[PDB]
Amino acid sequence: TRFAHITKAHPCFNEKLHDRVGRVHVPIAPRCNIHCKFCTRDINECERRPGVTGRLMTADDAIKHVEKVKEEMPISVIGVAGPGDALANEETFEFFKKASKKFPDLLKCMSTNGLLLPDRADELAELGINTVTVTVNAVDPEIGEKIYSFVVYKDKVYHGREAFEVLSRNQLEGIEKLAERGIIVKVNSVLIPGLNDEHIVDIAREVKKRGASLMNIIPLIPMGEMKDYPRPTCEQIERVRNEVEKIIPVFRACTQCRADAYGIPGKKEADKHLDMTPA
Ligand code: CLF
Ligand code: SF4
Ligand SMILES: [S]
């Protein structure tokens, strides 16, 4: 059963552990293959948005960082949320091989946008990765085209609906590939008011078919091209959570943490900027 695989000792699965057990994000994945109309990807030591990091690390330096934080804080997960996409940077794999031997105790976890899941799902299973998160914001191309601008696949660029149809085929087939390989898939969905508002439930039924075990509906952080957009009301994100919960289990404590965040997602720290700022 796919249910016997999904268990909770990870804080981003089961909210009763979120403010209890740690996790570490290594900022080792800077490049990205797609363009989300709400992504901004930055480098600073303040904002808490997911595409933010204080400094990028090398795979070997990330090992030393995990080792150092393990001793000082209570860690249980190692995740590559990385500025861009964790499947699009070979250093994520380079790290996951090194961490498979150096840290056999902490469970491995990583975030992706599915586009490279068909090509790299085989590798993921070989690295002993436990959970992977896929960011699915739409299934209907009429919705999806309004969310993504460009997609890079097979050394070529895609635009509009053509770009979305490549992404949708890869993410959904990527969930089903991962589910078969034994990897527990989580699906993050950003609730964009006016766009996928009345579409989130359709997404939940599609990802359930593909084998996704949990769904994390998160409100939009109006950034990128959608800076003018409104952050959905908390009363509205609970309305979609209560109907989606009837189909697939729902995570309710996502704090949209940055790609360098280490520590318990109740009292976590971030990587300091890097000394190169005088005038
Ligand atoms: S890749 Fe993996 S599942 Fe993602 S955070 Fe990182 S360890 Fe966890 Fe956690 S609170 Fe929400 S769901 Fe994330 S944005 Fe952070
Ligand atoms: S997957 Fe992340 S890095 Fe890539 S476009 Fe979307 S928000 Fe930006
Ligand atoms: S995540």
mmCIF file of C-alpha atoms and ligand atoms in Angstrom:
data_model
loop_
_atom_site.group_PDB
_atom_site.id
_atom_site.type_symbol
_atom_site.label_atom_id
_atom_site.label_comp_id
_atom_site.label_asym_id
_atom_site.label_seq_id
_atom_site.Cartn_x
_atom_site.Cartn_y
_atom_site.Cartn_z
ATOM 1 C CA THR A 1 0.000 0.000 0.000
ATOM 2 C CA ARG A 2 1.181 3.552 -0.671
ATOM 3 C CA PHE A 3 -0.317 4.449 2.791
ATOM 4 C CA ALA A 4 2.078 2.132 4.710
ATOM 5 C CA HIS A 5 4.981 4.049 3.092
ATOM 6 C CA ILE A 6 3.672 7.532 4.278
ATOM 7 C CA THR A 7 4.561 7.924 7.996
ATOM 8 C CA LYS A 8 5.264 11.032 10.087
ATOM 9 C CA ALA A 9 8.640 11.878 11.746
ATOM 10 C CA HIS A 10 9.110 14.823 9.191
ATOM 11 C CA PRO A 11 7.740 18.272 10.210
ATOM 12 C CA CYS A 12 6.415 19.226 6.731
ATOM 13 C CA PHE A 13 4.114 16.158 6.969
ATOM 14 C CA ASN A 14 1.925 16.172 10.086
ATOM 15 C CA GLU A 15 1.672 19.639 11.607
ATOM 16 C CA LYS A 16 1.967 18.302 15.210
ATOM 17 C CA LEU A 17 5.707 17.797 14.509
ATOM 18 C CA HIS A 18 6.323 20.998 12.484
ATOM 19 C CA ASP A 19 7.071 23.097 15.613
ATOM 20 C CA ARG A 20 8.965 20.136 17.176
ATOM 21 C CA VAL A 21 11.476 18.459 14.854
ATOM 22 C CA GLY A 22 14.037 20.263 12.698
ATOM 23 C CA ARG A 23 14.915 20.408 9.008
ATOM 24 C CA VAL A 24 17.770 22.014 7.068
ATOM 25 C CA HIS A 25 17.649 23.596 3.612
ATOM 26 C CA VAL A 26 20.873 23.663 1.654
ATOM 27 C CA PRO A 27 21.058 26.535 -0.883
ATOM 28 C CA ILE A 28 22.795 24.407 -3.506
ATOM 29 C CA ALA A 29 20.257 24.664 -6.370
ATOM 30 C CA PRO A 30 20.391 28.163 -7.963
ATOM 31 C CA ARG A 31 19.399 27.568 -11.632
ATOM 32 C CA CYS A 32 15.797 26.977 -12.719
ATOM 33 C CA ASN A 33 14.154 25.614 -15.856
ATOM 34 C CA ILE A 34 10.767 27.386 -15.834
ATOM 35 C CA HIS A 35 9.306 30.877 -15.164
ATOM 36 C CA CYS A 36 6.563 31.176 -12.532
ATOM 37 C CA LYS A 37 4.655 34.499 -12.917
ATOM 38 C CA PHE A 38 5.004 34.900 -9.097
ATOM 39 C CA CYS A 39 8.695 33.838 -8.605
ATOM 40 C CA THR A 40 11.347 36.441 -7.848
ATOM 41 C CA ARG A 41 14.449 34.411 -6.690
ATOM 42 C CA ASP A 42 16.748 36.662 -4.664
ATOM 43 C CA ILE A 43 19.858 36.855 -2.531
ATOM 44 C CA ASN A 44 19.501 38.772 0.781
ATOM 45 C CA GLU A 45 19.466 38.230 4.597
ATOM 46 C CA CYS A 46 15.955 39.465 5.449
ATOM 47 C CA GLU A 47 12.839 38.362 3.374
ATOM 48 C CA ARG A 48 11.357 34.950 4.273
ATOM 49 C CA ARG A 49 9.878 34.020 0.849
ATOM 50 C CA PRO A 50 10.736 30.511 -0.548
ATOM 51 C CA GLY A 51 13.031 31.626 -3.416
ATOM 52 C CA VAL A 52 15.391 33.553 -1.127
ATOM 53 C CA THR A 53 18.864 32.637 0.135
ATOM 54 C CA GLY A 54 21.675 34.476 1.962
ATOM 55 C CA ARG A 55 24.527 32.793 0.099
ATOM 56 C CA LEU A 56 24.820 29.787 -2.260
ATOM 57 C CA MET A 57 26.814 26.793 -1.075
ATOM 58 C CA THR A 58 28.820 24.157 -2.914
ATOM 59 C CA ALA A 59 27.744 20.497 -2.451
ATOM 60 C CA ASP A 60 30.844 19.739 -0.284
ATOM 61 C CA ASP A 61 30.364 22.923 1.835
ATOM 62 C CA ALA A 62 26.673 21.974 2.257
ATOM 63 C CA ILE A 63 27.866 18.664 3.828
ATOM 64 C CA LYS A 64 29.986 20.555 6.410
ATOM 65 C CA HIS A 65 27.014 22.886 7.086
ATOM 66 C CA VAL A 66 24.623 19.941 7.718
ATOM 67 C CA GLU A 67 27.249 18.353 10.004
ATOM 68 C CA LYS A 68 27.662 21.636 11.962
ATOM 69 C CA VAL A 69 23.933 22.370 12.384
ATOM 70 C CA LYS A 70 23.176 18.686 13.327
ATOM 71 C CA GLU A 71 25.258 19.100 16.534
ATOM 72 C CA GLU A 72 23.844 22.477 17.595
ATOM 73 C CA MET A 73 20.151 21.960 16.624
ATOM 74 C CA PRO A 74 17.704 18.984 16.537
ATOM 75 C CA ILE A 75 17.636 18.013 12.811
ATOM 76 C CA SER A 76 15.610 15.106 11.271
ATOM 77 C CA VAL A 77 15.218 16.202 7.564
ATOM 78 C CA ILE A 78 17.756 17.435 4.927
ATOM 79 C CA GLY A 79 15.992 19.220 2.077
ATOM 80 C CA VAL A 80 17.157 20.823 -1.164
ATOM 81 C CA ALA A 81 14.628 23.629 -1.664
ATOM 82 C CA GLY A 82 17.388 25.654 -3.518
ATOM 83 C CA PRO A 83 16.634 29.028 -5.169
ATOM 84 C CA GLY A 84 15.676 27.479 -8.515
ATOM 85 C CA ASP A 85 14.764 23.848 -9.125
ATOM 86 C CA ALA A 86 16.451 20.926 -7.291
ATOM 87 C CA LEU A 87 16.220 18.543 -10.330
ATOM 88 C CA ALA A 88 17.733 21.190 -12.676
ATOM 89 C CA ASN A 89 21.059 21.409 -10.781
ATOM 90 C CA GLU A 90 23.420 18.412 -10.918
ATOM 91 C CA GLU A 91 24.934 19.582 -7.580
ATOM 92 C CA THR A 92 21.700 18.425 -5.851
ATOM 93 C CA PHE A 93 22.499 14.834 -6.973
ATOM 94 C CA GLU A 94 26.220 15.313 -6.112
ATOM 95 C CA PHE A 95 25.101 16.329 -2.611
ATOM 96 C CA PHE A 96 22.530 13.524 -2.223
ATOM 97 C CA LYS A 97 25.195 10.915 -3.005
ATOM 98 C CA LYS A 98 27.609 12.468 -0.432
ATOM 99 C CA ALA A 99 24.777 12.780 2.179
ATOM 100 C CA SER A 100 23.640 9.159 1.618
ATOM 101 C CA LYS A 101 26.940 8.006 3.181
ATOM 102 C CA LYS A 102 27.764 10.978 5.493
ATOM 103 C CA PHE A 103 24.210 11.279 6.988
ATOM 104 C CA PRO A 104 22.349 7.883 6.930
ATOM 105 C CA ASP A 105 20.167 8.961 9.885
ATOM 106 C CA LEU A 106 18.357 12.093 8.549
ATOM 107 C CA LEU A 107 15.634 11.580 5.952
ATOM 108 C CA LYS A 108 16.304 13.194 2.544
ATOM 109 C CA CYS A 109 13.640 15.524 1.070
ATOM 110 C CA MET A 110 13.520 17.924 -1.885
ATOM 111 C CA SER A 111 11.277 20.337 -3.749
ATOM 112 C CA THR A 112 10.754 20.285 -7.511
ATOM 113 C CA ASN A 113 8.411 21.535 -10.284
ATOM 114 C CA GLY A 114 8.104 18.096 -11.991
ATOM 115 C CA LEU A 115 9.546 19.061 -15.434
ATOM 116 C CA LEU A 116 12.630 16.828 -14.886
ATOM 117 C CA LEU A 117 10.907 14.062 -12.879
ATOM 118 C CA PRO A 118 10.554 11.669 -15.881
ATOM 119 C CA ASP A 119 14.288 12.041 -16.627
ATOM 120 C CA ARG A 120 15.632 11.986 -13.048
ATOM 121 C CA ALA A 121 13.076 9.884 -11.026
ATOM 122 C CA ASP A 122 15.260 6.767 -11.485
ATOM 123 C CA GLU A 123 18.260 8.627 -9.954
ATOM 124 C CA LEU A 124 16.066 9.938 -7.038
ATOM 125 C CA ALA A 125 15.198 6.347 -6.025
ATOM 126 C CA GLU A 126 18.938 5.351 -6.137
ATOM 127 C CA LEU A 127 19.912 8.222 -3.794
ATOM 128 C CA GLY A 128 17.600 6.959 -1.005
ATOM 129 C CA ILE A 129 15.354 10.104 -1.170
ATOM 130 C CA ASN A 130 12.303 9.685 1.078
ATOM 131 C CA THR A 131 9.899 12.512 0.088
ATOM 132 C CA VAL A 132 9.655 14.857 -2.840
ATOM 133 C CA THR A 133 7.370 17.903 -3.174
ATOM 134 C CA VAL A 134 5.937 18.812 -6.597
ATOM 135 C CA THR A 135 4.570 22.324 -7.162
ATOM 136 C CA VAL A 136 1.339 21.850 -9.178
ATOM 137 C CA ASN A 137 -0.588 25.121 -9.660
ATOM 138 C CA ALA A 138 -2.888 24.009 -12.520
ATOM 139 C CA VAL A 139 -4.181 21.066 -14.539
ATOM 140 C CA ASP A 140 -6.519 22.887 -16.993
ATOM 141 C CA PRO A 141 -4.263 24.537 -19.662
ATOM 142 C CA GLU A 142 -6.630 27.554 -19.772
ATOM 143 C CA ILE A 143 -5.523 28.215 -16.098
ATOM 144 C CA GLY A 144 -1.879 27.030 -16.421
ATOM 145 C CA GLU A 145 -1.015 29.286 -19.358
ATOM 146 C CA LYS A 146 -1.842 32.342 -17.156
ATOM 147 C CA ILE A 147 0.667 31.131 -14.492
ATOM 148 C CA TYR A 148 3.845 30.247 -16.438
ATOM 149 C CA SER A 149 5.701 32.305 -19.067
ATOM 150 C CA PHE A 150 8.447 29.955 -20.356
ATOM 151 C CA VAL A 151 9.592 26.331 -19.978
ATOM 152 C CA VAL A 152 13.058 24.986 -20.816
ATOM 153 C CA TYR A 153 13.162 21.324 -21.845
ATOM 154 C CA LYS A 154 15.500 19.314 -24.099
ATOM 155 C CA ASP A 155 17.660 22.498 -24.725
ATOM 156 C CA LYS A 156 14.573 24.288 -26.230
ATOM 157 C CA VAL A 157 12.232 27.009 -24.909
ATOM 158 C CA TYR A 158 8.372 26.718 -24.853
ATOM 159 C CA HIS A 159 5.824 29.570 -24.574
ATOM 160 C CA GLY A 160 2.199 30.084 -23.446
ATOM 161 C CA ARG A 161 -0.042 26.999 -23.558
ATOM 162 C CA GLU A 162 2.746 25.022 -25.301
ATOM 163 C CA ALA A 163 4.988 25.586 -22.265
ATOM 164 C CA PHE A 164 2.259 24.626 -19.772
ATOM 165 C CA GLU A 165 1.293 21.445 -21.640
ATOM 166 C CA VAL A 166 4.970 20.245 -21.461
ATOM 167 C CA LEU A 167 5.100 21.001 -17.710
ATOM 168 C CA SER A 168 1.701 19.388 -16.935
ATOM 169 C CA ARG A 169 2.639 16.183 -18.789
ATOM 170 C CA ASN A 170 5.960 15.984 -16.888
ATOM 171 C CA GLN A 171 4.674 16.861 -13.358
ATOM 172 C CA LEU A 172 1.680 14.501 -13.432
ATOM 173 C CA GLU A 173 3.637 11.593 -15.073
ATOM 174 C CA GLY A 174 6.429 12.470 -12.565
ATOM 175 C CA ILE A 175 4.103 12.004 -9.577
ATOM 176 C CA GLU A 176 2.968 8.588 -10.940
ATOM 177 C CA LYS A 177 6.599 7.605 -11.644
ATOM 178 C CA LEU A 178 7.626 8.596 -8.103
ATOM 179 C CA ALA A 179 4.652 6.871 -6.454
ATOM 180 C CA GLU A 180 5.547 3.600 -8.184
ATOM 181 C CA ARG A 181 9.216 3.908 -7.111
ATOM 182 C CA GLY A 182 8.077 4.125 -3.422
ATOM 183 C CA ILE A 183 8.691 7.873 -2.981
ATOM 184 C CA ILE A 184 5.922 9.731 -1.028
ATOM 185 C CA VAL A 185 4.878 12.782 -3.067
ATOM 186 C CA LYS A 186 3.512 16.014 -1.515
ATOM 187 C CA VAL A 187 1.807 18.626 -3.756
ATOM 188 C CA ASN A 188 2.238 22.335 -3.003
ATOM 189 C CA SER A 189 -0.345 24.551 -4.728
ATOM 190 C CA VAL A 190 -0.374 28.332 -4.583
ATOM 191 C CA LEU A 191 -3.849 29.740 -4.286
ATOM 192 C CA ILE A 192 -3.854 32.644 -6.807
ATOM 193 C CA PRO A 193 -7.056 34.687 -6.359
ATOM 194 C CA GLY A 194 -8.979 35.048 -9.601
ATOM 195 C CA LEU A 195 -6.820 32.522 -11.438
ATOM 196 C CA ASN A 196 -6.900 28.941 -9.929
ATOM 197 C CA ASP A 197 -9.288 29.965 -7.078
ATOM 198 C CA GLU A 198 -12.131 27.533 -8.181
ATOM 199 C CA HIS A 199 -9.606 25.067 -9.723
ATOM 200 C CA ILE A 200 -7.654 23.850 -6.612
ATOM 201 C CA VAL A 201 -10.177 20.944 -6.091
ATOM 202 C CA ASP A 202 -9.652 19.751 -9.704
ATOM 203 C CA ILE A 203 -5.855 19.745 -9.009
ATOM 204 C CA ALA A 204 -6.423 17.646 -5.874
ATOM 205 C CA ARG A 205 -8.402 14.995 -7.818
ATOM 206 C CA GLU A 206 -5.665 14.770 -10.518
ATOM 207 C CA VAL A 207 -2.751 14.454 -8.053
ATOM 208 C CA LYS A 208 -4.677 11.812 -6.010
ATOM 209 C CA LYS A 209 -4.881 9.691 -9.233
ATOM 210 C CA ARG A 210 -1.121 10.108 -9.726
ATOM 211 C CA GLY A 211 -0.393 8.892 -6.172
ATOM 212 C CA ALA A 212 0.284 12.163 -4.271
ATOM 213 C CA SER A 213 -0.186 11.424 -0.559
ATOM 214 C CA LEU A 214 -0.562 14.938 0.886
ATOM 215 C CA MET A 215 -1.496 18.394 -0.457
ATOM 216 C CA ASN A 216 -0.251 21.790 0.779
ATOM 217 C CA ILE A 217 -2.416 24.705 -0.409
ATOM 218 C CA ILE A 218 -0.507 27.910 0.270
ATOM 219 C CA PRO A 219 -1.602 31.540 -0.139
ATOM 220 C CA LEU A 220 0.122 33.637 -2.784
ATOM 221 C CA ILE A 221 2.938 35.980 -1.775
ATOM 222 C CA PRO A 222 2.245 38.746 -4.342
ATOM 223 C CA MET A 223 5.662 38.980 -5.983
ATOM 224 C CA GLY A 224 7.167 38.715 -9.486
ATOM 225 C CA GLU A 225 4.736 39.591 -12.282
ATOM 226 C CA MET A 226 1.814 39.188 -9.833
ATOM 227 C CA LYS A 227 2.992 41.928 -7.404
ATOM 228 C CA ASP A 228 -0.377 43.748 -7.891
ATOM 229 C CA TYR A 229 -2.362 40.585 -7.025
ATOM 230 C CA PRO A 230 -4.057 40.218 -3.620
ATOM 231 C CA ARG A 231 -2.902 37.612 -1.020
ATOM 232 C CA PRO A 232 -5.986 35.396 -0.627
ATOM 233 C CA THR A 233 -7.962 35.785 2.596
ATOM 234 C CA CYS A 234 -7.285 33.161 5.315
ATOM 235 C CA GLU A 235 -11.063 32.480 5.452
ATOM 236 C CA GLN A 236 -10.934 31.638 1.679
ATOM 237 C CA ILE A 237 -7.804 29.338 1.869
ATOM 238 C CA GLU A 238 -9.624 27.339 4.632
ATOM 239 C CA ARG A 239 -12.726 26.971 2.386
ATOM 240 C CA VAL A 240 -10.581 25.332 -0.329
ATOM 241 C CA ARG A 241 -8.672 23.301 2.337
ATOM 242 C CA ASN A 242 -11.905 21.922 3.814
ATOM 243 C CA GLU A 243 -13.186 20.689 0.408
ATOM 244 C CA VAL A 244 -9.796 19.414 -0.829
ATOM 245 C CA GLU A 245 -9.389 17.559 2.561
ATOM 246 C CA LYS A 246 -12.428 15.400 1.580
ATOM 247 C CA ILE A 247 -10.320 14.013 -1.377
ATOM 248 C CA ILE A 248 -6.647 13.919 -0.232
ATOM 249 C CA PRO A 249 -5.089 14.694 3.241
ATOM 250 C CA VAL A 250 -4.117 18.380 3.748
ATOM 251 C CA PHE A 251 -1.019 19.992 5.420
ATOM 252 C CA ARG A 252 -2.001 23.067 7.430
ATOM 253 C CA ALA A 253 1.240 24.609 8.809
ATOM 254 C CA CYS A 254 3.292 25.701 5.782
ATOM 255 C CA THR A 255 5.294 28.845 6.597
ATOM 256 C CA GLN A 256 6.767 29.267 3.041
ATOM 257 C CA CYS A 257 10.357 29.193 4.330
ATOM 258 C CA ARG A 258 13.359 30.388 2.292
ATOM 259 C CA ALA A 259 15.837 28.057 0.491
ATOM 260 C CA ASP A 260 18.601 28.487 3.147
ATOM 261 C CA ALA A 261 16.420 28.001 6.312
ATOM 262 C CA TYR A 262 17.841 25.638 8.963
ATOM 263 C CA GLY A 263 16.229 24.782 12.280
ATOM 264 C CA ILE A 264 12.749 23.973 13.556
ATOM 265 C CA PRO A 265 10.097 25.822 11.474
ATOM 266 C CA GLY A 266 8.860 27.387 14.835
ATOM 267 C CA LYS A 267 12.269 29.038 15.669
ATOM 268 C CA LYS A 268 14.571 28.657 12.536
ATOM 269 C CA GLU A 269 17.648 30.585 11.291
ATOM 270 C CA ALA A 270 18.948 31.614 7.825
ATOM 271 C CA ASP A 271 22.399 31.967 6.179
ATOM 272 C CA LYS A 272 24.116 35.315 6.839
ATOM 273 C CA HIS A 273 24.486 37.500 3.700
ATOM 274 C CA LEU A 274 28.305 36.928 3.148
ATOM 275 C CA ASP A 275 31.042 39.541 3.794
ATOM 276 C CA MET A 276 31.306 41.546 0.534
ATOM 277 C CA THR A 277 29.074 44.602 1.314
ATOM 278 C CA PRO A 278 31.229 47.773 2.154
ATOM 279 C CA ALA A 279 31.097 50.854 -0.170
HETATM 280 S S1 CLF B 1 11.629 20.841 0.696
HETATM 281 FE FE1 CLF B 1 11.064 19.189 2.173
HETATM 282 S S2 CLF B 1 8.843 19.548 2.461
HETATM 283 FE FE2 CLF B 1 9.644 21.516 1.632
HETATM 284 S S3 CLF B 1 10.032 23.039 3.550
HETATM 285 FE FE3 CLF B 1 11.935 21.784 2.787
HETATM 286 S S4 CLF B 1 12.038 19.918 4.145
HETATM 287 FE FE4 CLF B 1 9.874 20.718 4.136
HETATM 288 FE FE5 CLF B 1 7.808 22.881 4.916
HETATM 289 S S5 CLF B 1 7.085 24.880 6.150
HETATM 290 FE FE6 CLF B 1 6.087 24.972 4.044
HETATM 291 S S6 CLF B 1 6.135 22.761 3.432
HETATM 292 FE FE7 CLF B 1 8.034 23.741 2.492
HETATM 293 S S7 CLF B 1 7.567 25.983 2.574
HETATM 294 FE FE8 CLF B 1 8.861 25.201 4.351
HETATM 295 S S1 SF4 B 2 9.841 26.636 -9.614
HETATM 296 FE FE1 SF4 B 2 10.596 28.144 -8.050
HETATM 297 S S2 SF4 B 2 12.478 29.061 -9.007
HETATM 298 FE FE2 SF4 B 2 11.326 28.017 -10.699
HETATM 299 S S3 SF4 B 2 10.012 29.689 -11.598
HETATM 300 FE FE3 SF4 B 2 8.720 28.624 -10.016
HETATM 301 S S4 SF4 B 2 9.038 29.848 -8.108
HETATM 302 FE FE4 SF4 B 2 10.722 30.442 -9.563
HETATM 303 S S S B 3 7.931 22.586 0.527
#
